[PDB]
Design a protein around this ligand. Sequence first.
Ligand SMILES: CC(C)=CCC/C(C)=C/CC/C(C)=C/CC[C@H](C)CCOP(=O)(O)OP(=O)(O)O
Ligand SMILES: CC(C)=CCC/C(C)=C\CC/C(C)=C/CC[C@H](C)CCOP(=O)(O)OP(=O)(O)O
Lengths: 347, 347
Amino acid sequence: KVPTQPIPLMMNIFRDVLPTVHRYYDQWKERAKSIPDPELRAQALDALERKEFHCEGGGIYGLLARDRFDELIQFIIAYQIMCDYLDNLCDQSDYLDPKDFRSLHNALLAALTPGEPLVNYYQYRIEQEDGGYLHELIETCQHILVTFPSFRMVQENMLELSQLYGDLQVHKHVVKEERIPRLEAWFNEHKEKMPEMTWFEFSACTGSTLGVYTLATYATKEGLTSEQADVIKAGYFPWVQGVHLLLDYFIDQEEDIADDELNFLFYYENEEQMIERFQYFVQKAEESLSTLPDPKFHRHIWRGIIAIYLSDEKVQKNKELKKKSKQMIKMGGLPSLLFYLNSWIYR
Amino acid sequence: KVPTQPIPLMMNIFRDVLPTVHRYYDQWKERAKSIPDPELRAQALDALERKEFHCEGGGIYGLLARDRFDELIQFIIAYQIMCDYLDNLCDQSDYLDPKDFRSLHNALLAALTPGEPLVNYYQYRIEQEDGGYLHELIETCQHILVTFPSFRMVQENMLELSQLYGDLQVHKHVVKEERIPRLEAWFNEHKEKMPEMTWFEFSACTGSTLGVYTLATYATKEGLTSEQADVIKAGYFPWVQGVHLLLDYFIDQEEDIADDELNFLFYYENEEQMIERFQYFVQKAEESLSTLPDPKFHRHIWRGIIAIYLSDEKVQKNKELKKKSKQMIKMGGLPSLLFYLNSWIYR
Ligand SMILES: CC(C)=CCC/C(C)=C/CC/C(C)=C/CC[C@H](C)CCOP(=O)(O)OP(=O)(O)O
Ligand SMILES: CC(C)=CCC/C(C)=C\CC/C(C)=C/CC[C@H](C)CCOP(=O)(O)OP(=O)(O)O
């Protein structure tokens, strides 16, 4: 059974999770260095250099499936590396062609579809020589997932989350003036199925990968039911994924204002409403997580996400953001502890 | 209103204690570079290089005296730097003269005796030109302690612990053949006023500075009685100071074997007696710590000391030492967590 007490959970993270994450991550770093196209190489290495924490955090789900520990971390790391690589490629495109953004994100859907024939995901952009990097990442996922006893039961739900994540990456990276009309029209198709929320709250709920890793984790269990597959998707989507991205956008506010970049928090009528809605998402997230298997573990992961996000220098060394962050959620001083701990190690 | 819950205690340590300690420690580092005698300078800078942990640890007592936070830490750092400097001078002496060791350790007594004129502490050795380094360490302690409203009530108890510490350093640093006779002779002078223990256990009890820092901490309070000063001293001496040094000697057994250093544990008649007496000291130490003001704070600092000591790779990588350590004290998974955390940070 998974560790649910702080000491053994932290001990297993430092002893087993991080060394195993970095064994697989460091191999992708070496592979990325050999990418022929200098722009694809730069974008790959940048994501690997800057977004290590996504794989390190993602790898913690390994603890729920000890008997498939290495395979599950390998899947999560390959999929998460792809997301951060493709985000860079869309972010740094001089061309802003949505066909390119869509074509690239179809790599994530292929990763979740064993035997899906691999295409030129780069077909709508000038840079196409990656020396097999993206293909290698896709096949890694395909060959691992097919070996999980209940992958077939969760596949449809993983594809649902991955398509929504892809649609977001397409709409939010097009030329500035076309973004919000695309996001509102897209939200409009799903708004009936969703709890009552705005286009920009919906946009945040689709932007996380946590549901995919959770569904892949339970795919390792014998005889997982379709009822359980749906419980597990509803555990993280929409509310936990929402809080995750609302936090990402909260921390990044000052640089989004400075670089006139799309920030979903900016479409709230005022900050009072943003704080109220953030607190609602947190309550609905607590309720959705409590429905999962291993509820105490999921509750630990989520509290960890919140504390780690709020421990950012961008929040903790900015008097107004820090004060606003405590209005949003009280974490018994954990964000601040992680900041000063971090500040102390790196000096 | 002293923090005793783990998250805030740790946050204060990383935000307040460690940065304040390193501010003053760094000023002493720069001051030490101005020492004229090359050998005194090398020994002062080597102590400062290798022994920052003693100051970081000692500085945690600040949190019991927030009012005088900066002043108390300046006293603790000045005294501890003096201790580690004198320890280097006595260890690396080519002339092993107990007049020199005694004269040097008389600096600690001067540090605790404001308004009394200073000698040449180097009067019994070749190297004498330190440019006022040792006098400035003494003067720093004197100038802070006089400002403590209850210093006068604790000064006798502090000088008592400083005298025993000085005595130990004198006897343990002489030529190998005359150590145990001095230590046994010295213990026999004190045997009748001490609880039942060996000369080598007594030696362990006198070798810590925790009692001095704790008494200095309660000197910062108005209207401390003689009774309360005797309670505070008895809370650390002898049992807590004994556990602190016995644990140091336990961890360094292979080192002290290989470098042929004096190790008080080796004079137990067998391992089983060693473990049994260690367990007894722990019981008495738990008892004496529970008699203190802010007993939860003292318990936490003491369990932290122990967890940090036992987390040493010297213990965690050695099957036999790990086995014995878990017999000696029940710490749960904390030493192991600290080991894998340290292993991860310093990879
Ligand atoms: C403790 C634990 C389980 C953690 C899991 C964390 C995780 C799996 C995160 C990835 C989930 C994921 C891909 C989140 C989106 C974050 C992404 C960095 C947002 C992109 O915009 P931007 O912020 O501007 O980035 P960039 O342009 O500077 O590169
Ligand atoms: C509250 C908290 C966390 C306290 C921490 C402890 C402290 C403040 C003082 C140690 C108290 C103290 C002076 C202990 C004895 C020090 C001893 C000489 C160091 C160990 O010996 P060794 O390594 O062999 O010398 P060297 O060869 O490296 O130079």
